[PDB]
Design a binder for this molecule. Structure first.
Ligand SMILES: [Zn+2]
Ligand SMILES: [Zn+2]
Lengths: 169, 169
C-alpha cells in the first residue's frame, strides 16, 4: 500500500494477536508480520495465514502485571536503567494491567542477572512477573526450523540478538 | 541462515549504520533491514545495497545527548512514563553519549505534547535533545514513494503507527 508493504504487530497474547491481525485486515492490511518471544504465538500467527515472523533467540520478554500502574512503572524503570547500562535494546508497551519489556543484545550471564532482578523488583513493588523466551541457542535453532516447516517464508531477528547468538555459536 | 532470513538494524547515524551493516556482512549476514525515523539514513541503507526498510510515519525518535548518563536516564524515564500512559510503543538504545527513544502509536496532538516535554526535560536535566521524523502524513507518503524509486523492495511499518496514520488519512 501507499505507506508500506508490511505491518509489524508485537504480540504478547494469542487472542490479542488474532484480534489485532483481524482489525488490520479489516482496515485493508495485506501483509502482517508478528513479533513475539513466545514460539506458540508465532505458530498461531502462521496458522492465521501470516508468513513473516520476528523471533527473539538470546533475549527475553519480561511482563510485569498488577492493578497499580505506578508500581508496574517503578519496576519497569529499574529494569530499563540496568538493561541500557548492559548495552541492551529495549521495546516497551502497556497492555491493560501488563507492562511488556522486550530485551535483546545482552549475553546469557547478563540475561540471567536481569531475569533475577525482574523477580526481586516484582516482590519489592507487590506485582507479578512473567519471563518469555531466552536461555538456549539450540532451542532457538530448533524452533526456527519448526516455524519454517509450519510455512514461515521470512524470519527476522534483531541484529544485536543475532550477534550475541553468533558469539555463543 | 539457520537463525533467520533478515537482520534488523536500528540506525540513528549514517556512519554507525554503515559500520554495523559491514560488521554483519563480515559475520555472513545476507539480508539486513534498516529501521530509522531519518529518511536520509534509509536512503543511505538503499545506496549500500539493502532493499528492506522500517519507516516511522506518525511517530518520532527523541535523542537525549550529554556526558552524565544518570541525567540522560532521568529525562528518558519521564518520557517513557508519559508515552506509555498515552498508549505509545517505545524502543530504547544507549549509543555512546546518546539515549535514543523511538515513540509510535500516538496521535499528532500527543506527539506534539511529548516533543514539548522532551525540550523541557532536556533544559531541566542540563542535556541536549534532537527530534527526528513525525508531523506530516503527506511527507510520509512522499518519502515512502522516494524510497521505492531508490529501489526499496519491502517497507515495514509499526502497526500502531499505521493505524494512527489511517485514522489521520
Ligand atoms: Zn523487535
Ligand atoms: Zn521498530
Amino acid at each position: 500500500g501507499a505507506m508500506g508493504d508490511i505491518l509489524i504487530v508485537w504480540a504478547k497474547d494469542v487472542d490479542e494477536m488474532l484480534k489485532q491481525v483481524e482489525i488490520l485486515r479489516r482496515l485493508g492490511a495485506k501483509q502482517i508480520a508478528v513479533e513475539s518471544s513466545d514460539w506458540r504465538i508465532l505458530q498461531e500467527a502462521l496458522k492465521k495465514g501470516g508468513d513473516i515472523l520476528i523471533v527473539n533467540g538470546g533475549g527475553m520478554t519480561i511482563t510485569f502485571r498488577g492493578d497499580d500502574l505506578e508500581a508496574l512503572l517503578k519496576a519497569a524503570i529499574e529494569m530499563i536503567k540496568q538493561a541500557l547500562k548492559f548495552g541492551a535494546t529495549i521495546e516497551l508497551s502497556l497492555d491493560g494491567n501488563d507492562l511488556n519489556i522486550n530485551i535483546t543484545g545482552v549475553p546469557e550471564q547478563v540475561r540471567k542477572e536481569l531475569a533475577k532482578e525482574a523477580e526481586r523488583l516484582a516482590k519489592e513493588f507487590g506485582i507479578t512477573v512473567t519471563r518469555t523466551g531466552g536461555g538456549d541457542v539450540d532451542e532457538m535453532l530448533k524452533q526456527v526450523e519448526i516455524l519454517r516447516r509450519l510455512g514461515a517464508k521470512q524470519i527476522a531477528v534483531h541484529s544485536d540478538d543475532w550477534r550475541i547468538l553468533q558469539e555463543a555459536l
